[PDB]
Design a protein around this ligand. Sequence first.
Ligand code: B12
Ligand SMILES: CN(CC[C@H](N)C(=O)O)C[C@H]1O[C@@H](n2cnc3c(N)ncnc32)[C@H](O)[C@@H]1O
Ligand code: SF4
Length: 443
Amino acid sequence: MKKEILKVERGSIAEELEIEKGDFLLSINNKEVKDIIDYKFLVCDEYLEVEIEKSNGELWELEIEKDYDEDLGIEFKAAILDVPQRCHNNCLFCFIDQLPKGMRKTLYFKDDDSRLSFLQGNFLTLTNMKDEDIERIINYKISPINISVHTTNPELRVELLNNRFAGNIYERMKKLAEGGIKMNCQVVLCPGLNNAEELKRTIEDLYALYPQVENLAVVPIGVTKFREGLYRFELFNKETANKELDMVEEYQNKFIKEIGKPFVRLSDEFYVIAEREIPKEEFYDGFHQLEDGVGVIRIFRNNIKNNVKKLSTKVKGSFSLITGQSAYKEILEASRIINNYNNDINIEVIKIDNNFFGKTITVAGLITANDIIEQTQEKNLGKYVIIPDVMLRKGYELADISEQVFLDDVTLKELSKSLKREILVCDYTGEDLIDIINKHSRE
Ligand code: B12
Ligand SMILES: CN(CC[C@H](N)C(=O)O)C[C@H]1O[C@@H](n2cnc3c(N)ncnc32)[C@H](O)[C@@H]1O
Ligand code: SF4
């Protein structure tokens, strides 16, 4: 049951303590690590005594203080009996299947249900998990378990995921709830398949498990232009987004009356498509779903409103902000707020159409360098170009220059040379935009 180490994350605890690829993980707090479920339980602790066998045979005993939810930074080889490295689905909407061919290999990995995704707490369909796995999760009180539900209608879920076990999800969630496990849930909403009365059923079934099921996020199906031969979806438009938002509002009103929270939320893209006003900050209850596209517009507006009073009024600067279709109106309004506060901050916002993936793709993080270059050829860029960090692969801050990459594998430095401008990377929530402008403007 010794576990060969395959990867050590830059900046991690394991790296600090000189754990390396090819070392072996032997035990944590005197317990063997049988698989990823044991591992997740054992690292939920502020103190770990870790036994490592080095590749050269040395035995190390490490004393490790850490935050309870802090990761060690190691990935290790799967056991013969373990959570799989891949999903067991063929979702009708699978985002991997609608990638164009020829991109970097890691983009095609069907790893959203993998052992490493489970460890990170991503949304899981659980179709590749055995009942014994669920029972061990309960016994270990591994919580929360975040679940891609889509529908609690068993036959409908089998049809959406193409896995013969996929109808088990509601019985499995009931088991988790009865075991005291907390769950956050997601639905990918496909008009004519799992919306309307089907989403009503899903909402009702999930709320029956409150407070173990803590909330439900509903996101719209998104497509690229590369769906030849794949299932043909109807997309939400302004009419049907407004209809779905109105339908779900009946449930949100019920839940606000009962428990003081909306429980189910539709993601920001629904409000953009519907041209509907973004809810106030209280609706988002601490903004814990930002990485799932829920509450990002409102927190962005909040961060600009809060921080613009910190913009120096004595400086001058020029900036070009790069964004996509869904965010353009919000970024434009932030630029107007900034320029109203100090009109010597010359800011233009440049919307990039997603010709690479197809213009049905609209969120800012899917903009490629190729499209930025092509669509700024006839622009007079400001001294600094600012992009949001969602346009780069995760880890860019600590990464080597060659590893700060857009989805088309152009690096941040290469794009800067192409644009003949220094490029600044800002937090996609807007938290540091004013600060970056202050630091790059002249008195
Ligand atoms: C929803 C989503 C999708 C949908 C997109 C549908 C659509 N309409 O485009 C789907 C599922 C199709 C999708 C697919 C992919 N996605 Co995706 N997706 C997301 C997600 C979870 C939320 C995006 C969202 O809904 N935003 C809502 C809209 C309204 O806001 P926005 O456009 O994002 O803009 C806001 C902020 O970014 C900010 N902002 C925007 N521009 C600017 C500019 C400046 C200067 C500033 C200050 C702020 C700012 O303010 C806006 C709000 O006011 C993001 C996560 C994230 N943190 O962004 C990942 C994310 C964009 N996806 C990512 C990835 C990797 C992919 C895939 C490549 C995965 C794959 N292996 O195939 C695919 C590619 C396409 C495909 N194969 O279908 C990565 C991209 C990172 C990168 N660039 O390398 C992200 C960032 C998640 C991650 N893992 O880091 N995705
Ligand atoms: C949004 N992605 C993960 C979240 C993202 N990595 C983040 O920032 O947290 C991918 C997930 O979106 C869902 N998904 C897959 N295909 C589509 C699609 N075509 N449209 C919308 N959601 C999809 C699946 O649950 C998939 O695991
Ligand atoms: S679970 Fe579905 S969306 Fe995720 S990789 Fe597997 S088939 Fe694609």
